Amino acid sequence: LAPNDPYYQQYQWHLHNATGGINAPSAWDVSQGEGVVVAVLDTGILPQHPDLVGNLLEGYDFISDAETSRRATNDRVPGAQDYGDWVENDNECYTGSVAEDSSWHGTHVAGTVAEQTNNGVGMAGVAHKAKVLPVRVLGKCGGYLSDIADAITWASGGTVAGVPANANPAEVINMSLGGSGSCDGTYQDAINGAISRGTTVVVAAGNETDNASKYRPASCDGVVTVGATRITGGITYYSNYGSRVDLSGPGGGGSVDGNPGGYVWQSGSDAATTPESGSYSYMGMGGTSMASPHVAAVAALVQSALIAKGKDPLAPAAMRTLLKETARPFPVSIPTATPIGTGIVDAKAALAKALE
Ligand SMILES: [Ca+2]
Numbered sequence: 001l002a003p004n005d006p007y008y009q010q011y012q013w014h015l016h017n018a019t020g021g022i023n024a025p026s027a028w029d030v031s032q033g034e035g036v037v038v039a040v041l042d043t044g045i046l047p048q049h050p051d052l053v054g055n056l057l058e059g060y061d062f063i064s065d066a067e068t069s070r071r072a073t074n075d076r077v078p079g080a081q082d083y084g085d086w087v088e089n090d091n092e093c094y095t096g097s098v099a100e101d102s103s104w105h106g107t108h109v110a111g112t113v114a115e116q117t118n119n120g121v122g123m124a125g126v127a128h129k130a131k132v133l134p135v136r137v138l139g140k141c142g143g144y145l146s147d148i149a150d151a152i153t154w155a156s157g158g159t160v161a162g163v164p165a166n167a168n169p170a171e172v173i174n175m176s177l178g179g180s181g182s183c184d185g186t187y188q189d190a191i192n193g194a195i196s197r198g199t200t201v202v203v204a205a206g207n208e209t210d211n212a213s214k215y216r217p218a219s220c221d222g223v224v225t226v227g228a229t230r231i232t233g234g235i236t237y238y239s240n241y242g243s244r245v246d247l248s249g250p251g252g253g254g255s256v257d258g259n260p261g262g263y264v265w266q267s268g269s270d271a272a273t274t275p276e277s278g279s280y281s282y283m284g285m286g287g288t289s290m291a292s293p294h295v296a297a298v299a300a301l302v303q304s305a306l307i308a309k310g311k312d313p314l315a316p317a318a319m320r321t322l323l324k325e326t327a328r329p330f331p332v333s334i335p336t337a338t339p340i341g342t343g344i345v346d347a348k349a350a351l352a353k354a355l356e
Contacts, residue, residue: 003117005120007123007265007282011123011284012123013250014249014250014265015126019232020233020344022344022347026348027298028128030351030355031301032117032128033129034129035129036127036130036171036172037130037131037133038131038132038171038172038174038296039132040109040134040174041135041175042106042135042138043103043106043136044061044082049267051111052114052116054116055115055125055130057133058078059132060076060079062151063143064144064146068139076147084271084273084275085138085141086272101271101273104268104283105138106134107269108268108290109174109292110134112125112294113125114126114128126293127297130304133170135151135154145184146186149186150190152175152193153190155170156194157169157170158194169197171198171299172202172296174293174296175203176204177203178203178206178216178218179215179216182214183220191217198316200224200299200316201223201224202299203220203224204226204287204288205225205227205228206240207288208238210240210241211241212240212242212244212245218240224299224323225245226245226247226248226249226291226295227247227249227291227340228248228249229291229330229344230256230257231250231253233344234253237253237256238251238288240288242339246323247340247343249291249292249295249345250264250294250344252264252285252287253286262284262286263286264286265283267280267282267283298345298347302314302319302322302350305351305354305355306355314354322350323345323350324341326349327341327342328343
């Protein structure tokens with residue numbers, strides 16, 4: 001499939017480039033992810049973005065701190081509106097932290113997953129007939145372990161006190177987020193609950209040019225930990241690495257690969273602070289955060305194809321083996337000290353194996 005989105009051809013190398021893209025044109029002839037729900041645990045969402053609306057469920061805001069969520073209370077509320085995660089001053093988040101504009105990070109991630117495609121508007125997405133369930137866990141200066149833990153439980157269909165039952169349990173969870181420290185008992189239990197409910201959990205390896213075993217949920221047992229590659233198919237300068245990384249996806253090499261080839265492109269805003277301070281747009285970003293949703297969306301394409309054929313969806317362990325086993329080996333040498341999994345996720349190879 002060669003869709004008509006205006007900026008797809010020139011910008012979206014991560015979809016279609018022969019050496020760094022995930023072979024989406026060919027996968028899209030088999031599956032677009034219809035019927036599957038991907039939960040995006042992130043900064044929240046711009047719910048009326050015109051290239052997203054239509055593929056979004058209402059979702060939920062798990063941030064239990066008014067100063068972080070920028071809401072009027074510490075409650076968790078229905079809906080996932082991103083209020084903006086800008087930080088006005090250096091050092092507000094921690095000693096050494098730097099002021100920055102709002103990221104609209106979860107709208108970017110959600111676009112990778114399911115940006116409306118072949119609609120004559122903007123950019124494309126991978127699982128463009130799936131639904132995104134947006135679950136806001138990150139705000140000003142980030143988020144809290146126990147909000148992220150609970151969001152996992154709820155997104156995968158488990159019960160969380162104070163939150164109404166999730167009417168749309170997710171086949172896949174994406175976590176384009178992490179922190180310092182190897183996996184703790186709280187994260188692992190939450191992850192374990194999600195797996196026991198049939199949910200595949202896909203996470204970003206992290207961007208510290210460091211061993212993924214030192215970060216979470218990168219280092220947690222049972223998840224699909226995703227490294228970052230360049231348009232060239234080589235490791236990015238920032239990708240974490242190590243035996244915990246299962247495979248990679250396009251993260252964008254950064255300025256070394258220029259504009260547009262250094263960046264992943266999707267739905268966003270140019271707003272600096274609140275949503276109202278700017279307008280809907282398309283942004284280019286780099287990180288393992290951008291690689292992870294490509295993998296999470298491929299998992300969605302596969303569950304959807306299996307169901308469409310009346311076959312049984314894969315359990316989490318099977319899904320992870322499949323993604324790993326069908327990854328395209330790197331077109332450029334990966335340094336021995338920094339392994340980033342079996343290869344670059346290949347949506348078409350993943351589909352061909354699953355379907356027989
Ligand atoms: Ca579009």
